[PDB]
Amino acid sequence: GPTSFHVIQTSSFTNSTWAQTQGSGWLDDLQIHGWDSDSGTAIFLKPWSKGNFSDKEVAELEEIFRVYIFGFAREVQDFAGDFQMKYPFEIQGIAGCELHSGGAIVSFLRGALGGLDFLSVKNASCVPSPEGGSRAQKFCALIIQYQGIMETVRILLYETCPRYLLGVLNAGKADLQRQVKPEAWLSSGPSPGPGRLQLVCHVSGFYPKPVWVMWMRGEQEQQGTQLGDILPNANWTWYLRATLDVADGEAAGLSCRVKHSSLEGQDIILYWR
Amino acid sequence: IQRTPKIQVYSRHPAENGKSNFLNCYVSGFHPSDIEVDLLKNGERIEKVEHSDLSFSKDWSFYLLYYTEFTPTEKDEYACRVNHVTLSQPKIVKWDRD
């Protein structure tokens, strides 16, 4: 996907007495901001998490988010009845901006209710999602009247975010722009049947994310290769398993080949042996 | 509408007994967000287990990474135990070695 910074929110409304919110900020898959709910302050997980922003601007953004989180739960409790919400329910939000090929930075904001699309932002206006139903159309026609909320959202999406994204991309280039070589190893999985075997190729520790793994008979791509999911390690690296359902003896002179940008053209090749 | 969690277990490095390592349990695709996840050494909850802040995906389903440093032994079996509202009973997924 295109490079993107965004903050997210998860809000749980258990009863009209109780609610809870979780927040964080992200470069794509990599978390760079936490949020201390219990003290209403931001948590910077990288030395460059403030970007090129001043401690003045950061404190201003921190105060807007603190007021928003404080206010958001109360305003939902307040309007719950008029929206005919039954507890418990939950809400999620993501807002940010992404750098697209061609230089143009595109901002976005999306909200969900019960894990289902509820609204999104376009042309700096509220746009109800068909899945959000009557409540979504009621919400967008309502929020449009609070011009201060609309003003702040409009500024943060279109003024602050594009600046902050470029700032932070550069500020963290030492971590963001690096090549980490994977290690790879072979193993045998749970046999699919009798005589049959499952050849397993692990690839771990690569950065950045794109990667290519296939089971090989010499230069022939075994089209039966099943590719698992790319899974995270803690140290900003990834993990991937490629497996192949094969009959015994058919797994003779089979190799696992790994292409990755950090390998300088020297693919890892592991022969079953 | 609820979504049950997918549960995948893996080690950072290939298993070498005596060599330090990291055991990972990635849990994803679940909704709502409340969830309980443990790593087991021979059936017993491991104490100091780190984990990620809540995040979610394009489709709004949630995901977490739990992990811990450890050193595998010939005798030791390792697994990941996840409880969630969509699970009528805790789900265990073992760590496979060769």
Ligand SMILES: *[C@@H]1O[C@H](CO)[C@@H](O[C@@H]2O[C@H](CO)[C@@H](O[C@@H]3O[C@H](CO)[C@@H](O)[C@H](O[C@H]4O[C@H](CO)[C@@H](O)[C@H](O)[C@@H]4O)[C@@H]3O)[C@H](O)[C@H]2NC(C)=O)[C@H](O)[C@H]1NC(C)=O
């Ligand atoms: C944090 O970093 C961001 C991202 O870099 C930064 O915003 C950018 O600032 C630069 C200046 O440092 C802007 O560059 C200028 O943009 C204007 C109009 O957009 C251009 O007309 C300018 O071109 C002339 O000036 C240059 C000298 O800087 C000459 O080299 C050039 O040949 C032209 O004569 C100039 O390039 C850039 O547009 C912004 N971009 C955005 C999206 O804001 C921000 O200021 C940094 N600090 C903070 C606190 O955000």
Ligand SMILES: *[C@@H]1O[C@H](CO)[C@@H](O[C@@H]2O[C@H](CO)[C@@H](O[C@@H]3O[C@H](CO)[C@@H](O)[C@H](O)[C@@H]3O)[C@H](O)[C@H]2NC(C)=O)[C@H](O)[C@H]1NC(C)=O
């Ligand atoms: C409104 O909802 C909240 C949150 O669901 C309710 O608070 C909860 O009250 C129960 C009452 O016992 C607490 O249970 C206890 O939790 C601890 C763990 O913290 C557990 O070890 C105990 O055995 C016991 O189960 C629960 O913690 C508490 N939740 C929170 C977040 O504080 C509240 O009662 C509800 N009120 C109304 C009027 O509906």
Ligand SMILES: *[C@@H]1O[C@H](CO)[C@@H](O)[C@H](O)[C@H]1NC(C)=O
């Ligand atoms: C966004 O699009 C709408 C289309 O109806 C247009 O009327 C409006 O002027 C545009 N710009 C805004 C809302 O800033």
Ligand SMILES: [Cl-]
């Ligand atoms: Cl995988």
Ligand code: NA
């Ligand atoms: Na944290």
Ligand code: NA
């Ligand atoms: Na504050």
Ligand code: NA
């Ligand atoms: Na790890």
